[PDB]
Amino acid sequence: NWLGGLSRAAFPKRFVFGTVTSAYQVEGMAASGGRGPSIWDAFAHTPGNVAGNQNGDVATDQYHRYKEDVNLMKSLNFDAYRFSISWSRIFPDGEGRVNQEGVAYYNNLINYLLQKGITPYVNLYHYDLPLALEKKYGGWLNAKMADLFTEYADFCFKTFGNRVKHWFTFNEPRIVALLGYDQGTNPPKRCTKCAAGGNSATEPYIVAHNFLLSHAAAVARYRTKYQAAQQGKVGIVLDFNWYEALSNSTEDQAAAQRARDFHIGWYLDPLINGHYPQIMQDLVKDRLPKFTPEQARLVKGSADYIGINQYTASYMKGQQLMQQTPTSYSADWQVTYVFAKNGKPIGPQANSNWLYIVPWGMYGCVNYIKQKYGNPTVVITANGMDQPANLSRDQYLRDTTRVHFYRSYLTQLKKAIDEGANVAGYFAWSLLDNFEWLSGYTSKFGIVYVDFNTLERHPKASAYWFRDMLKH
Ligand SMILES: [Zn+2]
Numbered sequence: 001n002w003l004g005g006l007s008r009a010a011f012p013k014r015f016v017f018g019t020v021t022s023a024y025q026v027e028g029m030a031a032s033g034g035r036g037p038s039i040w041d042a043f044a045h046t047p048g049n050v051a052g053n054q055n056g057d058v059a060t061d062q063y064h065r066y067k068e069d070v071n072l073m074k075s076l077n078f079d080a081y082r083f084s085i086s087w088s089r090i091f092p093d094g095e096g097r098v099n100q101e102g103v104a105y106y107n108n109l110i111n112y113l114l115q116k117g118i119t120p121y122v123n124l125y126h127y128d129l130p131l132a133l134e135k136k137y138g139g140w141l142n143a144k145m146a147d148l149f150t151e152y153a154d155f156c157f158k159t160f161g162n163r164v165k166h167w168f169t170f171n172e173p174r175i176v177a178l179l180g181y182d183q184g185t186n187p188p189k190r191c192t193k194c195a196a197g198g199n200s201a202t203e204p205y206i207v208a209h210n211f212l213l214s215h216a217a218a219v220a221r222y223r224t225k226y227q228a229a230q231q232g233k234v235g236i237v238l239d240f241n242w243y244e245a246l247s248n249s250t251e252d253q254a255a256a257q258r259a260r261d262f263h264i265g266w267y268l269d270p271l272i273n274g275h276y277p278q279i280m281q282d283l284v285k286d287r288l289p290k291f292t293p294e295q296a297r298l299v300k301g302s303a304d305y306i307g308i309n310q311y312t313a314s315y316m317k318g319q320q321l322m323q324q325t326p327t328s329y330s331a332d333w334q335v336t337y338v339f340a341k342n343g344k345p346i347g348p349q350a351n352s353n354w355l356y357i358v359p360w361g362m363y364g365c366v367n368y369i370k371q372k373y374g375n376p377t378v379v380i381t382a383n384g385m386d387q388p389a390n391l392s393r394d395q396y397l398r399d400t401t402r403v404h405f406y407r408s409y410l411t412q413l414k415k416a417i418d419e420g421a422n423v424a425g426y427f428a429w430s431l432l433d434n435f436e437w438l439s440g441y442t443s444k445f446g447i448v449y450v451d452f453n454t455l456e457r458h459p460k461a462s463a464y465w466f467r468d469m470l471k472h
Contacts, residue, residue, distance in 0.1 A: 002403070002407075002465065002468075003407070003465075003468060003469050004407045004411060005411075006407065006410055006411065006414070006469050007469055007470075007471075008469075008470060008471075008472070010414055011414065011417065012417065015423075015424070015425060015426070016079050016080050016119070016379070016424060016425030016426070017077075017078055017079050017080065017425065017426055017427075017466075017470055018073075018078050018079060018080030018081055018082055018118075018119075018121065018425065018426070018427040018428070019073055019076075019078055019081060019082070019427060019428045019429075019430065019431035019447065020081075020082040020083070020381065020382050020427045020428065020429045020430055020431065021062070021082075021083050021084075021430055021431055021432060021434060022083070022084045022123070022126035022127070022128075022171065023083070023084045023085060023086035023089070023126060023128060024038065024040050024056045024059070024086065024126070024127065024128045024435065025056065025059060025060075025126075025430075025434040025435045025436070025437075026059050026060045026062040026083075026430075026431075026432055026434050026435070027056075027059060027060075027061075027062050027063045027086065027089075028056065028057065028058040028059040028060065028061040028062065028063050028064075029058075029061075029063040029064075030055070030056050030057045030058075030059075031057065033063065033089070033099075033101050033102060033105060034089070034092060034099035034100075034101045034102055035086060035088055035089040035092065035099065035102060036088040036089075036091070036092025036093055036094075036099075036130055036131065036132065037088060037130075037131040038086070038087070038088045038128040038129055038130055038131055039128070039129045039130075039131055039134050039139070039187040039188060040056065040127060040128055040187060041055070041056070041131065042131055042187070043186070043187040043189070044056060049438070050437075050438055050439075050440045051438065051439050051440035051441075051442045052440050052441070052442065054435070054440030054441055055435070055440075056435045058455075059434060059435045060432050060433075060434055060435075060450050060455065061455050062432070063105065065455070065457075066108070066109050066112065067112055068457065069431065069432065069457070070109075070112050070113055070116050070118060071116070072431075072448060072457060072459070073118060073431060074116045074117065074118060075467070076447075076459070076463055076466050076467045076470070077466065077467050077469075077470035077471055077472060078118065078466070078470065079118065079119060080118060080119040080120075080121055080166075080425065080427070081113055081118050081119070081120060081121065081431070082121040082122075082123065082168075082381060082382075082427045083109070083120070083121075083122065083123070084122070084123035084124070084125065084126040084128075084171065085106055085122060085123070085124055085156060086102070086128055087124070087125060087128060087129065087130050087152055088128065088130040088131070088132075089102040089105070089106075090102045090103060090106075090152070090155065090156070091130065091152060091155075092130070092132075093130060093132040093133075094129070094130030094132050094133035094136075094148065094152070095132075095133070095148060095151065095152075098155070103159060106160060107159075107160070110122075110160055110163050110164060111163070114163060119165075119166065120163070120164050120166065121166045121167075121168070121379075121381075121427070122156075122160070122164050122166065122167055122168070123167075123168045123169075123170075123171050123237065124149075124152065124153055124156060124167065124168065124169050124170070124218075125149070125169060125170045125171060126171040127171065127175075127176065127186075127437075129187075133145075133148060134187075134188060139188060140176065140180075140181075140206075140207040140210050140211065141203065141206055141207065141210070142210070143210055143213065145210050145213075145214050146210065146213045146214040146216075146217040147217070149169075149214040149217070149218055150214070150217045150218050150221050153169065153218040153221060153222070154218075154221050154225070157221070157222055157225070157226040157230070158226070161226055161230040161232060162229075162230060164232065165230070165231065165232035165233065166232060166233055166235075167222070167232060167233065167234040167235070168234070168235050168236055168237045168307055168381070169214070169215045169218050169219070169234060169235075169236050170211055170214075170215060170236055170237060171237045171309075172237060172238065172239040172309060173207070173208060173211035173212075173236075173238075173267065174208070174238065174239055174263065174266060174267065175239060176207060176211070177203075177204035177205075177207045177208045177211075177329065178204060178329065178330070180207070181198060181200070181203040181204045181206075181207050182200045182203075182204045182328050182329045182330055183200070183330070184196070184198060184200070185438065186437070186438070190203055192327070192328070200327065200328035200329065200330075201287060201326040201327055201328055201329070201332075202287050204328075204329040205284065205287055205288050205289060205329065206289065208266060208267070209289040209291075211267075212267065212270050212271075212299055213295060213298075213299070215236050215299075215302060215303070216295070216298040216299040216302045217298070218234070219234050219302040219303070220298060220302070222234050233304035233305060234303070234304055235303045235304050235305040235306060235307050235379070236267070236271070236303050236306070236307060237307030237308075237309060237381045237382075238264060238267050238268065238306065238307060238308060238309070239263075239264075239308075239309045239310075239311075240263060240264040240308050240309070240310055240365045240369075241263070241310065241311055241312045241313060241314065241361065241365070242310075242312070242313035242314070242358070242360075242361035242362075242364040242365050242368075243256045243259040243260055243263070243313070243314055243315075243316045244256060244313060244314070244315050244316065244346075244361075244364065245315070245316060245318075246315040246316060246317045246318075246338050246341060249318070250318075251317075251318035251319065251320070252316065252317055252318045253318070254318050255316040255317060255318030255319070255334075255335045255336070256316040256318075256335075257279075258279055258316075258318075258333055258334065258335055259314075259316050259333055259335050260368065261277040261279045261280060262277075262279075262280060262329075262332065262333045264365075264369075265277035265279075265280070266280060268306070268369070268373060270291070270296070270299045270300070271299065271300070271301075271302060271303050271306070272300070272301075272373045272374065272376060273300065273373075274291070274296040274297065274299060274300030275291070275296060276288055276291075280332075283321075283332055283334070284326075284332055287326060303376075304377070305376070305377040305378065305379050305424060306369070306376050306377065306378050306379070307378075307379050307380075307381035308365065308366075308369070308378055308379070308380055308381060309380075309381055309382035309383070309429070310361065310362050310365050310366075310380060310382075310383050310409075311355055311361075311382075311383065311384070311385075312354065312355050312356045312357075312358055312361055313346060313347075313356065313358040313360070313361030313364060314337050314338070314339065314346065314356070315337070315338040315339065315340070315341055315346060316335050316336070316337065316338065317335070317336040317337075317338050318334075318335065318336075319334060319335075319336065321334055322334065339356065346358050350385035350386050350387075350401075350405075351385075351386040351387055351388040351443055351444070352385075352386050352439070352443060355385055355386065357385060357401075357405060357408075359405075359408035359409045359411065359412045360412055361412075362380075362383070362409045362412040362413050362416070363412040363413070363415050363416045366378065366380075366413060366416035366417075366421045366423060367416050367419070367421065369421070370416070370419075370420065370421040370422070375420070375421065375422045376422065377422050377423075377424050378421065378422060378423045378424070379423070379424050379425045379426070379427070380413065380423065380425065380426040380427060381427050382427060382428075382429035382430075383406075383409055383426070383427070383428060383429060384402070384405070384406075384428055384429035384430060384445050384447075385401070385402055385405045385445070386436070386439075386443040386444055386445045387399060387401075387402070387443075387444040388442070388443070388444070389441070389442035389443070389444075391444075393449065393451065393458065396433075396444060396449045396458075396460060397449055397458060397459075397460045397461060398460075398461055399447075399460040399461050399462050400461060402447070402460070402461075402462040403461050403462050403465050406428070406462060406465060406466070407465070410426070413426065428447055428466065429445055430445045430446050430447070431446060431447065431448055432446040432448050432450050432457065433445065433446035433448070433449055433450040433452075434446065434450070446460070447459070447460055447462040447463040447466060448460065448463055
């Protein structure tokens with residue numbers, strides 16, 4: 001049967017199912033409603049940065065249509081909605097003056113969600129640093145971001161925390177470090193060879209450190225000032241794609257483990273154990289910032305749950321570890337990616353070249369966190385796949401590959417949960433086809449189709465699949 005034995009009865013009691021978007025990717029009204037620009041506004045408005053020079057100015061226009069979108073998600077039997085607040089929509093300059101019209105938008109959204117019985121899971125940050133903060137402070141290169149982010153977070157707790165009980169600080173700081181400061185393909189486009197300046201060997205580590213210190217400072221503020229009255233929780237969202245050793249050799253097993261440590265351990269070892277992974281300390285050395293004992297104690301235990309964005313998996317091949325001139329965070333791992341074993345591809349690709357459809361990667365990731373980190377509370381905060389551009393409406397709606405994607409990946413998650421992993425919920429990326437960063441509107445991740453000419457929403461087969469799977 002097309003559900004493949006899945007239903008709410010197949011998951012733990014009170015397991016949360018939702019969908020996810022992010023502010024810049026769906027809201028629109030990017031330069032209206034009093035919103036100040038983010039680094040993504042400047043980046044997307046520069047010719048050649050985004051596919052077809054597209055941008056998020058209008059996006060899906062959720063800003064005007066949110067009640068339609070909330071009605072839709074309720075009709076699809078979801079319990080929760082993960083969305084983000086645009087920092088520059090609240091503080092156009094990232095600090096100082098509050099944009100009251102911005103505040104009102106999020107009040108209206110949160111209240112309508114609650115009126116419809118959908119639980120808000122709110123991200124404070126999703127790639128969208130206020131441009132004014134980038135210019136004035138140097139953004140995530142500056143340790144002062146902890147203070148600035150904490151004040152922003154403080155306002156959000158005060159203003160929305162009587163209603164919002166599930167918070168996340170950041171979304172995938174590894175991708176910010178990697179794409180913004182290693183490869184220099186996302187804003188602020190920094191890297192060793194980059195026009196804007198940078199150093200791919202040092203800056204990604206500075207940036208990650210500052211994300212961890214900022215997260216810890218925001219959570220400390222929540223716990224000391226708001227928690228007693230509000231009784232909510234604050235986590236963080238981390239990307240984790242699976243790495244499988246290409247063979248059972250010592251070298252290949254070591255490579256796969258290195259990759260895990262540089263990918264997820266980079267953030268999880270500080271959050272769980274109060275230090276960076278040993279292998280990163282050994283290889284990256286004086287390029288890896290040191291937490292003081294006080295900072296390490298602030299960072300350790302500072303996430304009430306771990307959000308994991310899980311999409312894909314790779315084989316890893318190893319080598320003897322070399323002494324090497326440092327060139328980048330990516331090269332520091334000393335691994336070789338491989339996408340076939342025994343002459344067979346790890347899986348077929350979706351539209352995005354990096355996204356190999358590998359359902360057992362979900363089991364791999366969830367099992368690994370369970371076994372390595374003392375089984376912390378995990379929420380799958382994003383999982384999904386994309387269709388390409390230029391299909392007809394009907395072709396988008398008959399998304400049988402995505403139906404197969406969710407059934408297979410959710411079966412693998414169920415497998416990990418039945419073996420004892422503490423997973424509290426699951427969120428599909430995305431509710432809507434949206435602005436997919438560098439791919440612009442050429443990548444369609446939604447379970448709901450969006451006609452980007454008319455802005456009309458049309459549920460795809462995968463939306464109906466969720467509706468049937470999730471019926472109460
Ligand atoms: Zn509109």
